[PDB]
C-alpha cells in the first residue's frame, strides 16, 4: 500500500539525468562488466594459450588487432566460471584460459535483456507504444544466434566470434571459406534489409530536408522548427509528387512509411539469424547439386559459382593450420591448392 | 560482374588483393550501412511509438493519417521524452529537421567513404598491413588476428584465376 | 572469355545457370580498357565470346 | 442461430496487394534456385 516495494519503485523511477528503473538493476552491472571486460582484455590480456595469438595493447596490438579471444577448443562449451573447475578461482589462470570471453558474452547477453527491458519500462512510463523494444529484438536475435547458438552447435566456444575488429573480420572470412555464407538466401535477405534500411534512412532524411516548408527567414533552416508545433515541417504532398514522378511510386501515408522503416532492417536481421542457426549445424547453402553434377562430368563448364568454391578451398587449406591450432594440421607444401605461379 | 555470384567473386578477390576489410574507408562504409539500418529502425520505431490515437482496435492505425493533412501525426515531444530517457536528454533530437538531416548524412557520408575506398584501392592504396607486426624478444613472429586474416587472404590469392598467372607477382 | 585465356565462363540461364549463379560476364582481359562496341567486332558471335554485352550494359 | 456479434469485415487495399505480390514474387525468385538445387 505504502511499503518498501513502492518506495523503492519511487526511487528507481525518479526523473534524473540517467534513468535507472527496475530494468537498471540488471542492465547497468551487466553492460558495465561487458564493456569493462572488453576494455580490460583488449588492453592487458593475451590469447597465447588459447589461440597462439597476441591480442592486447600490452603485447603490441593496435585498436584494429586487439581482441578478447574465445577459449581453447578443449574447453568445449564450458561456462568457464571464475570459480569453476577449469580456473578454480585463479583470476590470472582464468584470463589465460579465455574466461573473459564467456564473461563478456554472458554479461553482454543479460545486459541486452536489461536494455530491452529498459525500452519497455520507459515506454510504459511515458505512455508510448513499445515498438522501439520490439525493434531491438533484431539485435538480440543476431547476438544470440551468432555469439551463443552458433558456437553451441559447433565443437566449442572457440568458433564463436572473438570480440575484436580483426577477429570479426577473420569470422567473416571463415564463414565464406567454410560455410559459403554469401550463397545463403537467409544472409542475402539480411543484406537486403541492412542495405535497404540504409537506403530508407538516406532517402527519408533527404526527402524531408528537401521538402521543408519555409518557416523562417534564415538560410540555415534548422531554427525554423519548434518541437511543440502542430503542423508538419515538410510537405508530404510535394514529396509524394516528386517520387511518383521520379521513381513511379511514392509513400502517401506517413504512418506506413515509418512502420516500413522499422520492418525492413528488423526483418533483415531476423532472417540473417535464422541462417546462422543453420550454420551452427553446418547446415549450409554450400552447393548447387545440379552445378556440381554438370561440372564433374564436363571440364569446360564454368560459372562464377564454381570459381567461388575454388576460392573457398584456398581459404580453408591456407587458413586452417593457424586458425585451428588444436587440430595440429600439417599440410605439406605439395598438397596446398594453388593456381599457376601464385 | 553483373550477377549475384559474380558479385561475391569480385568481393573475395578484392579482399585478397587489397585487404579491404582492414581499410578504414570500407570500415566507415560499414558504419554507414549498419548505422543507416540502425537509425532507420530507430526512427521508424520512435515515430510508430508515438502515433496519436485516431483509430479503433479493429482498424489499421495507418488510417489515422490522411495524405496531405496539415497536422503532424505523431507526438515528437513524446518520442523525444522517450528516447532522451532511454539514453540521456541531450543524446536525443528534439528538432525534426536536425534529426532528418542526420538520417540523410550518416548513410550518405559513410557510403561516400565506401565508394572512395573502392576508388582508391583502384590505385592500390590498400588496407592496413600488420603482417608480422608483433615480434618477441628473439625475433619470433607472434601472430595476431591480422596474421590469420592474412592466411585467409593467401588462400584467395593463390586460387583465384588459377590459369591466368605465369609470373610470381599479381601486379594488377 | 573473361580472363582472356580462352577459358569461357558461362553466365546465362540457358547455358546452365540459375538466378544465383547467373551473370552478364565482364569483357575479356585481352581487351583491357579498349572500347569494344558491337561495330568493332567482326561478328556478333565474336562480340559475344569477348564479353561485348558487359561494356554496352 | 442468432448471428455472432464478433464478426468483422476483412480488408486488403490495392497497395497492400501490390506489396504482397512483390514480396511473394521476389521471395520466389530468390528461393527458386535452391528449390531446383
Amino acid at each position: 500500500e505504502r511499503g518498501w516495494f513502492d518506495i523503492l519503485d519511487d526511487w528507481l523511477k525518479r526523473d534524473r539525468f540517467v534513468f535507472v528503473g527496475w530494468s537498471g538493476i540488471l542492465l547497468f552491472p551487466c553492460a558495465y562488466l561487458a564493456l569493462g571486460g572488453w576494455l580490460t582484455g583488449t588492453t592487458f590480456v593475451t590469447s597465447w594459450y588459447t589461440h597462439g595469438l597476441a591480442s592486447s595493447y600490452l603485447e603490441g596490438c593496435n585498436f584494429l588487432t586487439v581482441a578478447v579471444s574465445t577459449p581453447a577448443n578443449s574447453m568445449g562449451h564450458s561456462l568457464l566460471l571464475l570459480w569453476g573447475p577449469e580456473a578454480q578461482g585463479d583470476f590470472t589462470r582464468w584470463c589465460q584460459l579465455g574466461g573473459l570471453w564467456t564473461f563478456i558474452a554472458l554479461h553482454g547477453a543479460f545486459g541486452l535483456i536489461g536494455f530491452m527491458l529498459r525500452q519497455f519500462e520507459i515506454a510504459r512510463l511515458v505512455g508510448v507504444r513499445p515498438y522501439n523494444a520490439i525493434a531491438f529484438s533484431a539485435p538480440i536475435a543476431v547476438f544470440v544466434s551468432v555469439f551463443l547458438i552458433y558456437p553451441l552447435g559447433q565443437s566449442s566456444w572457440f568458433f564463436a566470434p572473438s570480440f575484436g575488429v580483426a577477429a570479426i573480420f577473420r569470422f567473416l572470412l571463415f564463414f565464406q571459406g567454410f560455410h559459403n555464407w554469401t550463397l545463403n538466401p537467409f544472409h542475402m535477405m539480411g543484406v537486403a534489409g541492412v542495405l535497404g534500411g540504409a537506403l530508407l534512412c538516406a532517402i527519408h532524411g533527404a526527402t524531408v530536408e528537401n521538402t521543408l516548408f519555409q518557416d523562417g527567414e534564415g538560410a540555415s533552416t534548422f531554427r525554423a522548427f519548434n518541437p511543440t508545433q502542430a503542423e508538419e515541417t515538410y510537405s508530404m504532398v510535394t514529396a509524394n509528387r516528386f517520387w511518383s514522378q521520379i521513381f513511379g511510386i511514392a509513400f502517401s501515408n506517413k504512418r506506413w512509411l515509418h512502420f516500413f522503416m522499422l520492418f525492413v532492417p528488423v526483418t533483415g536481421l531476423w532472417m540473417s539469424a535464422i541462417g546462422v542457426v543453420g550454420l551452427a549445424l553446418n547446415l549450409r547453402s554450400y552447393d548447387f547439386i545440379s552445378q556440381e553434377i554438370r561440372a564433374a562430368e564436363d571440364p569446360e563448364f564454368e560459372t562464377f559459382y564454381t570459381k567461388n568454391l575454388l576460392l573457398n578451398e584456398g581459404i580453408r587449406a591456407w587458413m586452417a593450420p593457424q586458425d585451428q591450432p588444436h587440430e595440429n594440421f600439417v599440410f605439406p607444401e605439395e598438397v596446398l591448392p594453388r593456381g599457376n605461379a601464385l | 560482374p553483373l550477377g549475384i555470384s559474380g558479385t561475391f567473386n569480385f568481393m573475395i578477390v578484392f579482399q585478397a588483393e587489397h585487404n579491404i576489410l582492414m581499410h578504414p574507408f570500407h570500415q566507415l562504409g560499414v558504419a554507414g550501412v549498419f548505422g543507416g539500418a540502425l537509425f532507420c529502425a530507430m526512427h521508424g520505431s520512435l515515430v510508430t511509438s508515438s502515433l496519436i490515437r485516431e483509430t479503433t482496435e479493429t482498424e489499421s492505425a495507418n488510417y489515422g493519417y490522411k495524405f496531405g493533412q496539415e497536422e503532424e501525426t505523431y507526438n515528437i515531444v513524446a518520442a523525444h521524452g522517450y528516447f532522451g530517457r532511454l539514453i540521456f536528454q541531450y543524446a536525443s533530437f528534439n528538432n525534426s529537421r536536425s534529426l532528418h538531416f542526420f538520417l540523410a548524412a550518416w548513410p550518405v557520408v559513410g557510403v561516400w567513404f565506401a565508394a572512395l575506398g573502392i576508388s582508391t584501392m583502384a590505385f592500390n592504396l590498400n588496407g592496413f598491413n600488420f603482417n608480422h607486426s608483433v615480434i618477441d624478444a628473439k625475433g619470433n613472429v607472434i601472430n595476431t588476428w591480422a596474421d590469420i586474416i592474412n592466411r585467409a587472404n593467401l588462400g584467395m590469392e593463390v586460387m583465384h584465376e588459377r590459369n591466368a598467372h605465369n609470373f610470381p607477382l599479381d601486379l594488377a | 572469355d573473361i580472363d582472356g585465356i580462352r577459358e569461357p565462363v558461362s553466365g546465362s540461364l540457358l547455358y546452365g545457370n540459375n538466378i544465383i549463379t547467373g551473370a552478364v560476364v565482364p569483357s575479356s582481359n585481352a581487351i583491357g580498357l579498349h572500347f569494344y562496341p558491337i561495330w568493332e567486332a567482326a561478328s556478333l558471335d565474336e562480340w559475344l565470346y569477348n564479353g561485348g554485352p558487359y561494356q554496352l550494359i | 442461430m442468432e448471428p455472432n456479434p464478433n464478426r468483422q469485415p476483412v480488408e486488403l487495399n490495392r497497395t497492400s496487394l501490390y506489396l504482397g505480390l512483390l514480396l511473394i514474387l521476389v521471395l520466389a525468385l530468390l528461393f527458386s534456385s535452391y528449390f531446383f538445387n
Partner: peptide, 30 residues
C-alpha cells in the same frame, strides 16, 4: 523448366511494376 520458371517470375515482377505505377490507387488530399 528451370529457365522458364525464372523468366516467368521475372516477367510477373515486371508486369507488377507496370500495374503498381500506372494502376495505383491514386493518392488523394483531404
Amino acid at each position: 523448366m528451370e529457365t522458364i520458371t525464372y523468366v516467368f517470375i521475372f516477367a510477373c515482377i515486371i508486369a507488377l511494376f507496370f500495374f503498381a505505377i500506372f494502376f495505383r490507387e491514386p493518392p488523394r488530399i483531404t
